[PDB]
Design an enzyme around this catalytic site. Sequence first.
Site, short mmCIF file in Angstrom:
data_model
loop_
_atom_site.label_atom_id
_atom_site.label_comp_id
_atom_site.label_asym_id
_atom_site.label_seq_id
_atom_site.Cartn_x
_atom_site.Cartn_y
_atom_site.Cartn_z
N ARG G 120 0.81 -1.22 0.00
CA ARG G 120 0.00 0.00 0.00
C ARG G 120 0.83 1.26 0.00
O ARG G 120 0.36 2.32 -0.42
CB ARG G 120 -0.93 0.04 1.20
CG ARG G 120 -2.04 -0.98 1.16
CD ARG G 120 -2.83 -0.94 2.44
NE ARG G 120 -3.89 -1.95 2.45
CZ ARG G 120 -4.91 -1.94 3.28
NH1 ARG G 120 -5.02 -0.97 4.18
NH2 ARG G 120 -5.84 -2.89 3.22
N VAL G 121 2.06 1.16 0.49
CA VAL G 121 2.93 2.33 0.55
C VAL G 121 4.29 2.09 -0.09
O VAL G 121 4.99 3.04 -0.46
CB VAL G 121 3.07 2.87 1.99
CG1 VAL G 121 1.84 3.66 2.39
CG2 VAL G 121 3.32 1.73 2.98
#
Lengths: 116, 121, 118, 239, 49, 252, 128, 126, 266
Positions: G120-121
């Site tokens: 996600r990051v």
Amino acid sequence: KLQFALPHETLYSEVTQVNLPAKSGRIGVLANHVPTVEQLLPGVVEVMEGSNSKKFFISGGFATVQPDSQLCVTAIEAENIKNLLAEAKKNVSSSDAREAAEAAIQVEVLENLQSV
Amino acid sequence: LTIAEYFRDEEGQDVLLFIDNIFRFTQAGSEVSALLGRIPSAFGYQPTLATDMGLLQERITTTKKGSVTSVQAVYVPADDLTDPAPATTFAHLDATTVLSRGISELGIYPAVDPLDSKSRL
Amino acid sequence: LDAAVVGQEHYDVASKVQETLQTYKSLQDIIAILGMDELSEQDKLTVERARKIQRFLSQPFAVAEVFTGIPGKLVRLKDTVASFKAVLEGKYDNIPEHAFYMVGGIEDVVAKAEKLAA
Amino acid sequence: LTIAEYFRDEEGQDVLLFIDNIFRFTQAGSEVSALLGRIPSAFGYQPTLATDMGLLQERITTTKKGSVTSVQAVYVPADDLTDPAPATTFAHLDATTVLSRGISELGIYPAVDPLDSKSRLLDAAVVGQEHYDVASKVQETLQTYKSLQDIIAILGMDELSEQDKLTVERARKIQRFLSQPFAVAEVFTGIPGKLVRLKDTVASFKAVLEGKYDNIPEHAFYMVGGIEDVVAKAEKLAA
Amino acid sequence: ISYAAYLNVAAQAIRSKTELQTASVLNRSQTDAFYTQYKNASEPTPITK
Amino acid sequence: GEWFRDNGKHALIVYDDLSKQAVAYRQLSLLLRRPPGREAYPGDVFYLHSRLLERAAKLSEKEGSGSLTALPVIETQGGDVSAYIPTNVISITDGQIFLEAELFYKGIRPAINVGLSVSRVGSAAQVKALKQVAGSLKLFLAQYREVAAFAQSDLDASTKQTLVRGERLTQLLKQNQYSPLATEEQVPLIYAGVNGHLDGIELSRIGEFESSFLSYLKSNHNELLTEIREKGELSKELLASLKSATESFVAT
Amino acid sequence: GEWFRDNGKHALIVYDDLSKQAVAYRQLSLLLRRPPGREAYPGDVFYLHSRLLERAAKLSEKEGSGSLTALPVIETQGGDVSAYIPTNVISITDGQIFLEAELFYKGIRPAINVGLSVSRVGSAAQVK
Amino acid sequence: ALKQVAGSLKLFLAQYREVAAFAQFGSDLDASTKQTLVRGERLTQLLKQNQYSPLATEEQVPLIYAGVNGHLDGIELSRIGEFESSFLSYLKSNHNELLTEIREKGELSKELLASLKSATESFVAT
Amino acid sequence: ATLKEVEMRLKSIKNIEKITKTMKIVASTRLSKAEKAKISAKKMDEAEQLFYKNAETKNLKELIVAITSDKGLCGSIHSQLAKAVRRHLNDQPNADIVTIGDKIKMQLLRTHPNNIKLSINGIGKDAPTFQESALIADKLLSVMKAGTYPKISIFYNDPVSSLSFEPSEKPIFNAKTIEQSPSFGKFEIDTDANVPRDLFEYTLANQMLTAMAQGYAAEISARRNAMDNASKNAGDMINRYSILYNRTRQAVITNELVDIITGASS
């Protein structure tokens, strides 16, 4: 070379002579026959290799000799109680009902089949 | 196990321990927990299912002296490999030996299924 | 979602879209086991159209730009209404499904359809 | 029950006892259990569900002093026949009629499940061999039907054997023939109630099973009385 | 009556003890075939072949 | 029942049924406020039934050779063997005879589901005569059941023979209530089935057949009935005699 | 681990596994007679993990830039990710590498089911 | 009035349900079976209804009568809504006689049945 | 969601799996019997349609006989033959269509309803036979006046292999066309009888069979494929619903157990 064929079974796919039941004259197709088209009546078909002669009882159909001298035979079919089925056609002679439109056709071949 | 440990620890033997059946040890532990008044965990099992299993399994091992090697019949409830019983038991298994009616009927003794028996080693 | 607020047209189009999707969803067990070929042609047609609307509802978000890898489109309500209405009328049946996927309004599907053929 | 008992013993005669609905005795009990300080039992029922029921049912019995024919309506929670309550009720009965949603939903009243209803009295020694045999074939015919509905589901009729096509078509008839207009049910049908003598029921189904009525259409068996009525309705739809 | 239908009736004498008569012989003989005439959706009654 | 066992005799005990016992035990336990568990049974309910069922036993010669034999009964709900008590009992005993509503309505009474029933003792608990003719029987009904769903046309000579034989053995095994058969009446019925002598008779008559075959065997071949009953075994001459008596009855 | 994060260095922490920790915690909880919820886990099992996995961070240069990185391990049962403990940690972490029994059986190892896996990051963190 | 026109409507809708399940597994059937497949599909459509739009009995009886007796079978499905309100407005202006009578007498005499049959059939041929 | 919901909606898929599997083997035996019925039809074509090849017979309103079957559950047999007849009927919109099999009558009745004048029923149960072939062919002659169209076309499905099939067309030539064929003279036919007339009525019957036998075998190999893929996919749902069940079953028991424990504190 002979090509005997039925829709359910396939009989013949080298052959010296074949005797067929034609328009009336039972024809003996020799090894170099001039191309013909004849309908087969019901009857016996005799394929001849050496001195072996395999008979076959036949529903009917068509024989053709080709340009390549090959014979092509086609029939639908290749006995139980003699008198049965014959009396199931005489009683239904019949009369004016369109049943006689077919039932009178049985006796044309059952005195031909039993002739053999 | 305590009998089986002494042969390892004082005799230096590689020892076999057959536990038959390991499922019934889980069930019994489950029963005691209920009787002592402890709140059942998921599916009725004791809340100590894993540590109870640990307390036994962790003793079967290799020491500098030798080894206890255990063969444990495992029963699977409803053939549900996810029921906490087998799930917790499987976490401790290093290999499996699967005997089968299918291999038996063919005439092969022992009746090991050679495509079903698996080993981490 | 009431004609008093959104306008009769908006409502009608929304409802027909919900109707379409639903008919596909009512047929899922059969699509899955037996496949498309065991449907009647009426259904086979309504299914083929739900499949398109289904995709046409996906949209690139501006903040999701890192997961789609696509400029985040933002579509106006009037445009949405006019775009779906047409898809219901069966104007864009010849168009393969993947064209409706992750785009904006109606013109963007046309843009993707020309892009994919050759 | 105490009133019914006094007739039984001291009128020394035959009482009828109708109870609607005995589930409510078990349910009501259940509703005070926790407040009487009891740990609940399975399904939230009282720990004493069965002995409570035993103490009630066992009093509802014919004795050597007199006779009680009792009829008890029995609610079935959420349709679940395995709910401890209906479950515990079953073995207290000599005859269970099971009404079935799926049967009522076909529009077949009474919604009796003809396989899941049981009686001690179904026994050659009690009904006579003939009655018994009809009943049995009727049940085989319906079970065969019940079984094949899974193949009727995916392939439809035309993959069935000739023997089975006949069994299925005879079962569909028998199914409808077991429906009947009740007099009490007139307001829901508009149909006058038919009350059919037992000896005619046997004789009727016997005939259906043997195939005496296979050319008769399927709708002529629905919501009627004895076989004479089937013949009568089949003439109506012929016009 | 027609050359096909005509050879067929001949294919049913040569087809009708029960010896030289395997399963598919008495299945060459049976037809579950019903011809329905059609005009402008259906028109008249379905008749046996 | 144990007095019998303990005095060199043999007794059968039927507990009808252990579901209801489990229920009263549970009622006691909750009322006495003991900790409940799965399904609100006390966590010693399993001990309740195994205390009880391990008391059935065959004693050693040293201790009289007496025996107790237990047929406990368990009611299931919607065939759910996974339920607490059914699970306990199924794990405690030596096998299940498992009965089913569906088989029943089909007419298969006793509604025994063979593929689900077991005797963990099995053949060692069986008259040698019956083990002999019915060793195969075990096999076929198993094969019948695999190929079962084919009962609905265009089938092998292999898979239809399976069908024909199975259908008949299934029918043979039907029985009326209150009429248990002697071992010497069973083996010839099962010799008949297993070894193909029924495949000609139509399924409707396997009833009247069993009836007529036994009576006939009683009138004419009381000799082998007796030997089956008395020796309990089947010599080679006996199968050959059985074969003779069977083939002679079928043709008539 | 935090020490490294706090002193301008980079520690990687592997929790192997949080399934078993949650099981241990359920034992503790039931013996303590806390209300059992979903799958007899206590009300606060989300919180158990959340406070844990929240201690992984990249720090700002104003705090020394040190970084803790967590790779927790969860064990699903028969591929079901909708179970209580799987969905809790999935809603704490910054993505999942989901490994699949069906792939692993065949040979595709690592059995990283791509479709059902996400970072996600870590986008910014990929070597160009 | 409503009881009479909705004879076995609920039981017929039951027949309509079983059928649209025999249709699902891909088969064209006969006349009578596709006739009830047509009727029930439109009766359903007739029973659809806007919110905050409750209908008076004398408005309901006509629509139902029209449905159950076959007069809608000729009409294309996606037009039943517009049929309803037009047919209503046709009766209010022209055959107000009837709707006044149905609202008043609550029942339906054969005189109101014959009038309705003659009215509905008239509107069907716009 | 509930145990009852899951138990009855798993069970039904366990049946479909067992069912679609049974008709994968049902239509495997039915393939062996219909490969021998196919070969005997295809071998017989070369022998019958050779005369026409040598006589060089070509064409000079149209009757279209379309053959699939009555049954469904067979991939896209009916769908891609109807697709063929439509691309053909696009060129010639003014033709009389005869259908053999209901699943092609419906495919066609929805697209060009008024072109269909005859339908044949109850067609794909056993293999096709000359009797069905000829009695269909006899009505063709009777009620459609088969003998009179300038062009007659049989549409059918050819089994390319076991795993696929091809939608195919063939012409039937009437008496007139046979007689007036370029190289007819090559054969010494006795012009007394109506050899062409008989040759036509025979070949109507015969080549229909040829078509039906192949289409039918094309179908039997699409049915044991659609069902093979059905069992393979029904078993995928049984994996989903076996696991969800083993879950919902545990959840049920745990929640009744929490209820019991709460009720047992107070």
